[PDB]
Design a protein around this ligand. Structure first.
Ligand SMILES: CCCCCCCCCCCCCCCCCC(=O)O[C@H](COC(=O)CCCCCCCCCCCCCCC)COP(=O)(O)OCCN
Ligand SMILES: CCCCCCCCCCCCCCCCCC(=O)O[C@H](COC(=O)CCCCCCCCCCCCCCC)COP(=O)(O)OCCN
Lengths: 250, 250
């Protein structure tokens, strides 16, 4: 009941089959990891003897999608040794701050991935397609969705102890806070894209005429941003939140 | 949350305060029913000595929103005799098959409502504006949103034991099959409007050139309709179920 988490789709421009891991699709608790390590073992077996590439859609991956240390460990010890080696490339799409922080929390186990040239962090579906068969990227429909009909606010500033220059992209279904400055994730300076589904925007608050707060469900401390067009960001987010509430279950 | 189930809002053209019962908001059971009924009491007591009106929002009212028999019967006794007589009108909006059936099954308890000139079914969402001014109307925003941007397919035919002419209206978040011909609900000829949120539309089938089926969640029997433009109705519905799925929870 988890053939959607890890599916095969496409071939790379280097001539290797592509396998997608939708991190958000997997849930720690419920979809027993025993079940996913199973399915990944099974769709890879026929392939991991020869070289293959992986695309991990870290899109909106959060703590509920995590690999607990015991599980995460089992992943670096449960495959034929060549199997790890034949992974020609692992495109990491939509890495966000939680996965990064997860990546730091589990640096003990992800030590091998640090600096690994094989991990290519990708910014958009278009940059991932370049490494694929005539740009036929099969990122989930859901993922690709987040890329269209976006109201983008550049030069925004996420306020925190460390201020992060970000662009706040408001899409009909989610707000994405794409960092404009790179930060390290597994030793590679990459852009982070934090996605906040309208369903998760509990409160939007305009602090100043150029600063707003975004309370995201279950993330406690609201996010804070500074931007010249704040009134407009807030209004766009409220709209998206409202259009969402209208279609809420009874 | 019982608090959004029944609330006071507006005054009718006849100068009577209106109360809205949003059926879908109630969930059958134990305590919800007495929260709900203790709530309607605390809300109505101030007004039920003078003529007041009720708009019953039956949109999407299904089994999970029903008043079990013992709970329903409390509604006809727990209020003062004058409270019942003071209801000058009960606008019934979006009555649907299930409710029709529910009232058929409780045809006994509902004898007092059967034939009642005080019950006004709103078969034309605009007809409500004939007893209550739009600015005084306060149907849930969600109920109202189901009326906007509807791709309407008139002259459809719903096959079943009895084939009823219907209009299939696909909106961004739902499919509504509105009977084109009236049926009796509590002795009144009215237009039912069954609503199927994209969230409930499991299987979508193009049975042939001018026919299609919808399999609805928790509804073993499939909705089978006929229409010239079926591939268009199937595509329309497939688009919204898909638009939905591509925006649901990881
Ligand atoms: C063996 C699987 C690796 C699982 C990694 C889980 C943690 C990911 C954290 C998010 C950022 C990194 C995503 C991409 C990780 C790619 C790791 C990789 O390349 O593993 C190679 C093998 O690649 C594969 O096995 C193919 C891919 C298998 C599925 C991977 C699914 C990753 C799911 C991540 C979920 C998000 C994080 C969850 C958070 C709480 C082998 O590495 P090695 O040679 O250093 O190993 C030495 C010991 N054997
Ligand atoms: C007393 C409350 C009536 C509850 C009716 C529940 C069943 C409704 C079934 C759906 C179609 C009808 C909806 C409108 C019903 C209006 C009933 C009404 O007018 O009651 C009058 C009183 O009106 C009011 O009390 C004000 C409104 C109170 C809230 C009503 C909420 C209705 C909720 C229906 C939920 C949908 C059905 C659930 C299904 C399984 C008094 O009638 P009477 O003089 O014959 O009574 C004699 C004995 N006392």
């Amino acid at each position: 009941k988890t053939l959607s988490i890890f599916y095969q789709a496409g071939t790379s421009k280097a001539g290797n089959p592509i396998f997608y891991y939708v991190a958000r699709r997997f849930k720690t608790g419920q979809i027993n990891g025993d079940l996913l390590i199973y399915h990944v073992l099974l769709t890879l077996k026929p392939y991991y003897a020869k070289p293959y590439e992986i695309v991990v859609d870290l899109t909106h991956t959060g703590p509920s999608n995590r690999f607990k240390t015991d599980f995460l460990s089992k992943w670096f010890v449960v495959f034929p040794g060549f199997a790890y080696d034949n992974v020609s490339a692992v495109y990491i799409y939509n890495c966000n701050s939680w996965v990064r922080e997860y990546t730091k929390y589990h640096e003990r186990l992800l030590t091998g991935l640090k600096g690994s040239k094989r991990l290519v962090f990708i910014d958009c579906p278009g940059k991932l397609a370049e490494h694929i068969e005539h740009e036929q990227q099969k990122l989930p429909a859901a993922t690709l969705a987040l890329e269209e009909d976006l109201k983008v606010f550049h030069n925004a500033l996420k306020l925190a102890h460390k201020d992060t220059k970000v662009s706040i992209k408001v899409g009909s279904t989610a707000v994405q806070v794409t960092s404009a400055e790179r930060t390290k994730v597994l030793g590679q300076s990459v852009f982070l894209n934090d996605i906040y589904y309208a369903s998760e925007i509990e409160e939007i608050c305009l602090v100043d005429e150029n600063q707003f707060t975004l309370t995201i469900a279950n993330q406690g401390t609201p996010l804070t941003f500074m931007h010249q067009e704040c009134e407009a960001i807030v209004q766009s987010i409220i709209h998206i939140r409202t259009r969402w509430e209208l279609s809420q279950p009874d």
